[PDB]
Every structure is written in structure tokens, then in C-alpha cells.
């Protein structure tokens, strides 16, 4: 679904803690499986969000079929599941908003406003 030609960061269990957990950035992470129609539908919008958010918010994706352990670690019971990783990287909240590029970016900016205002206080 994704490749080096896009701004979506491929997240394996072999870089997750490093790229995401030990990161001061806001992170959006999609947990998917490539055979899942709802996940395929989301792919273009996810890329659009990642590109729009370049250098502002980190946007990742995990094949939680190929890596079910990581999928299990975050209680992923379906695809696509989108998690938002804010100030506290151990309470990532679930996104249940629209799946358009704009909806994702709107949610991304809201979460970002919160991370920054947390920094301030």
C-alpha cells in the first residue's frame, strides 16, 4: 500500500519505540492490513495527510496483519485503526473522525494545538 515514494513512515516493530514512543512529535499511526477494503480506501487520503503534514506531524502506518504483535499491543481489533500519539505516548487516543485528507488533517491540527499548549504549561 505505501512505499518510499510517499511521506507515510512505514512502522515495523523494529522501529516503533524509537520512531514513535521516544518522540516529542505528534504522531498519527494507521494500523492496517493490505487485503482489507476499508484500509485500501483510506490509503490515498492517508498519503495526502502525510504530505500536507510534512515536518509538522509524523504520519505512520503499521501492517498489523504482518505484525500482529504490535497490533495486539494497542488492542487493534479491526482495520483501519488510527491512533493519535500526543504528549503522553502511552495513552494514544483513537481517532473516529472522517477518513478524508482534510478530516485527518483537522484532527491532526487539533491534537497538535493540545501538545503545544501542554508544552507551554
Amino acid at each position: 500500500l505505501y512505499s518510499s515514494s510517499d511521506d507515510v513512515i512505514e512502522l515495523t516493530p523494529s522501529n516503533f519505540n524509537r520512531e514513535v514512543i521516544q518522540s516529542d512529535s505528534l504522531w498519527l499511526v494507521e494500523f492496517y492490513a493490505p487485503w482489507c477494503g476499508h484500509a485500501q480506501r483510506l490509503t490515498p487520503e492517508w498519503k495526502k495527510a502525510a504530505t500536507a503534514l510534512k515536518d509538522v506531524v509524523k504520519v505512520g502506518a503499521v501492517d498489523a496483519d504482518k505484525h500482529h504483535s504490535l497490533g495486539g499491543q494497542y488492542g487493534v481489533q479491526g482495520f483501519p485503526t488510527i491512533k493519535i500519539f500526543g504528549s503522553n505516548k502511552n495513552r494514544p487516543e483513537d481517532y473516529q473522525g472522517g477518513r478524508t485528507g482534510e478530516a485527518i488533517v483537522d484532527a491532526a491540527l487539533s491534537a497538535l494545538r493540545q501538545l503545544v499548549k501542554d508544552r507551554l504549561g
Binding site: 492490513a33 487485503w35 482489507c36 477494503g37 496483519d65 487493534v76 481489533q77 479491526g78
Partner: peptide, 6 residues
Amino acid sequence: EVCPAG
């Protein structure tokens, strides 16, 4: 809106 995991 979602495919169940296995």
C-alpha cells in the same frame, strides 16, 4: 467501516 482482525 472496518475489517475485523484475525
